[PDB]
Amino acid sequence: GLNLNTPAYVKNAKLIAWVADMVALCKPDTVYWCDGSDAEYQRLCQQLVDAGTFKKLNEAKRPNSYLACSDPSDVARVEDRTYICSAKEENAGPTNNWMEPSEMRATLQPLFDGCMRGRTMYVVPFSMGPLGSPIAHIGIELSDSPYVAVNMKIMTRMGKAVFEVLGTEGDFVPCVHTVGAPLAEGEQDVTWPCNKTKYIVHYPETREIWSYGSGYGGNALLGKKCFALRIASNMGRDEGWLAEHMLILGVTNPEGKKYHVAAAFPSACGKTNFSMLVPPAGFDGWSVTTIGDDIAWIKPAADGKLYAINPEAGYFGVAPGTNMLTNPNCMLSVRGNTIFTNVALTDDGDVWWEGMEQDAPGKALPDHLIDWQGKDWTPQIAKETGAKAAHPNSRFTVAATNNPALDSAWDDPKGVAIDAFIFGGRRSTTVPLVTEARSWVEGVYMAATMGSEVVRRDPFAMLPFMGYNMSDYFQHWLDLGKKLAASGATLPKIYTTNWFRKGTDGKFVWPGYGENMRVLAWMIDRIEGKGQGEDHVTGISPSYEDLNWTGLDFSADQFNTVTSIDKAAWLKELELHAELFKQLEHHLPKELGETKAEIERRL
Ligand SMILES: [Mn+2]
Numbered sequence: 247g248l249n250l251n252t253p254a255y256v257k258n259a260k261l262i263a264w265v266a267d268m269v270a271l272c273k274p275d276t277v278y279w280c281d282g283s284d285a286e287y288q289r290l291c292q293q294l295v296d297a298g299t300f301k302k303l304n305e306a307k308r309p310n311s312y313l314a315c316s317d318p319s320d321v322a323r324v325e326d327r328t329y330i331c332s333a334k335e336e337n338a339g340p341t342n343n344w345m346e347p348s349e350m351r352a353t354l355q356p357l358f359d360g361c362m363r364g365r366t367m368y369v370v371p372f373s374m375g376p377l378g379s380p381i382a383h384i385g386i387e388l389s390d391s392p393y394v395a396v397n398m399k400i401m402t403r404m405g406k407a408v409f410e411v412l413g414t415e416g417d418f419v420p421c422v423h424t425v426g427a428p429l430a431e432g433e434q435d436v437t438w439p440c441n442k443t444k445y446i447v448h449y450p451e452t453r454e455i456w457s458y459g460s461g462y463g464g465n466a467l468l469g470k471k472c473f474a475l476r477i478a479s480n481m482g483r484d485e486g487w488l489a490e491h492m493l494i495l496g497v498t499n500p501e502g503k504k505y506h507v508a509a510a511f512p513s514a515c516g517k518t519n520f521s522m523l524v525p526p527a528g529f530d531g532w533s534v535t536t537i538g539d540d541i542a543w544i545k546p547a548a549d550g551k552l553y554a555i556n557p558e559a560g561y562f563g564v565a566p567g568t569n570m571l572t573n574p575n576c577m578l579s580v581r582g583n584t585i586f587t588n589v590a591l592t593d594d595g596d597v598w599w600e601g602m603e604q605d606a607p608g609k610a611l612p613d614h615l616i617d618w619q620g621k622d623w624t625p626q627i628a629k630e631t632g633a634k635a636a637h638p639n640s641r642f643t644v645a646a647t648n649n650p651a652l653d654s655a656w657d658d659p660k661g662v663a664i665d666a667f668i669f670g671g672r673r674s675t676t677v678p679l680v681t682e683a684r685s686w687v688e689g690v691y692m693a694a695t696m697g698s699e700v701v702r703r704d705p706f707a708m709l710p711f712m713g714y715n716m717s718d719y720f721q722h723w724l725d726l727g728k729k730l731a732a733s734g735a736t737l738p739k740i741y742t743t744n745w746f747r748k749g750t751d752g753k754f755v756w757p758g759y760g761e762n763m764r765v766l767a768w769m770i771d772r773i774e775g776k777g778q779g780e781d782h783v784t785g786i787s788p789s790y791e792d793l794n795w796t797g798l799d800f801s802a803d804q805f806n807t808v809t810s811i812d813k814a815a816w817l818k819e820l821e822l823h824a825e826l827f828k829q830l831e832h833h834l835p836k837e838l839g840e841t842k843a844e845i846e847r848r849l
Contacts, residue, residue, distance in 0.1 A: 282405015304595030339715030364429025379659030500531030527797025550733025599636035689740025
C-alpha cells in the first residue's frame, strides 16, 4: 500500500493488489489517488491550464470554465478500435469487434508496459449511480490523463466517498487507461497526448476495461460508455436488469400526477433536447424534468415496476446545434462551471459553436474565432473552405445540478418507475409521428428495427454499445417483458416516434423541439386511460383531434403528412427489416419473425 501512495482510508486489499499490478506494468513516475474534492478539482484544472491543455475562459463571460482542444486524430470514439473480448466470439455477436481474449491480452501487454513513464497515474474511484444505491456499481479508473480525472469528477460520483461503499472486500469494475505517450527524460510534452494506435477493450467475464491511445470522450472517460453500457449490459443480462442508451425524464400534468419516460434516439442531441424539453404554449400546467440524458440502468422490482437510475452525475453533451431555440435548459447549464472540448474561442475569451448564431442579433456569425485546431476562423474562411469553428463532435462537460430542470429525484438511490419507453429515429417517410405498440413484443420489435435516414439500423440505439450478442439482448428484453407481465402490474407502454417526416418539398413538417410536448402529452394521456387513437398496421396512433394544438398553428393536412401510413411504403420497410434480421440471425428470437409476419399478413 505505501509503495502505491495508498491513502489510509483505502482498506480493500484486492483493490490495492490490482493497483500494484497495474503500477508495476504501466510504471508511472508518481501515483495520485483522487479524493474528488473541490480543491483537488481546482488544482488539476490549474495544472491543465499550465500545461496548455486548458485555456481558462473569461470569468465574466463563463465563470470557472475551461476550453480544451484535442489532437485532430483524437476527436471521437473509434468504433473500429473497440473490442468485446468475450471467451467465445458468438458472445460478442455481429455488432461487435472480437478477438480471442488471450490474443488481445498479449497484444496489449507490450503497449501498457511502461506506458506511463514520465507521467502521473491518477487513481479515479467512482460510483455509477447514487452512492450506495442497490442499482449502483463502483469502478476504479487508472489514467495518466488529468483531463480524464477532472472530467470524471463531473461525470461520476468520484472520490474518497467511494471507499466507504466499497469497504474491505467490495468488488469494482477495473478500468485502466493510458494516452499511450510515455515521456523520456527531458522530453517535452504536448497539449493533448495521444497515440495513433488505439485500443478500447472490454473483457466481459472479468468486467475489465482497457483503453490505450485516446484521451477523448467515450474512449477515455471509461464510466460513460465502456462501463455504463458495454460492461453493464453484461452485468444486467446476468443479474436481471437493463443498461440502456436512454434518457430518463419526469413529466407532471396539471393534476399533479408524475410519470417517468425513458427514451432512446439514434441522434447526437435528440436525447438531450427531449430530456430537457420546455413545454410550449398550451401546456402551462405541465412540467418536464431531467433524470438523465444518456444512460439508464433499469431494474425490475417486486411490484412489477421498472425502476431506472441515471448512473452518471453530469452531462457530456454534443455542443454544436445547442442554442436557446433548440435547448434553453442546456444553454443555461453551460453558463458556468463547464469544461468545453473542441469548440471555438472568441476574441473576448468566451466559447462559440455552430448554431449559437441563432441567438445573436441578425443571426450574425462572429467576425473572428480561434477554431478547435487553433486556426484563425472567419465567416469567409467558413464560406469558402467549409471549415467548422467547433468540431462536429465537440462537447460540454457540466454537473447535472447546473440544469435548471434537473429532477429532484435525479440522485435518489431507488430510481424512478418507468411508465413508457420511447424509441425514436429519423425517417423521411414510412414511420408516423408517434405509434404506441399494442404489446410488449411489438414494442421490442419497434426497438429492434430503429433506423435513421440510406436508412441505417441502430437497434435500441445500442449498435456501438452492446456488451454481448445483440440477438441475446433482444431475448433479454422479451424475457423481461414476460416477467413484468407475470407480476400483474401494468406494463410500461412502448412508443415509436419520428420527428422528421418530410413533405413533397423535401422540408421537415413537424416543428419538433418544444412542440414534441404535444406528443409526450398524448403518451401520458394514454397511460392515464384518457388518450384516444386509431389502430393501424404497426400500432395505435393519435388522430388529429387527440392532440392538444393550443398555441401551435398546425393543420390537419400537415398532421396527415407526418402520420399517413402507406401500404407500399411499409412493404419496402419490412424488406429492410428482413435484411437486418439476417445479419442478426444467430439466436434471433422467433417473436421478431412472428411479429414481422403479422405485419405482413395485416398488410
Ligand atoms: Mn450517448
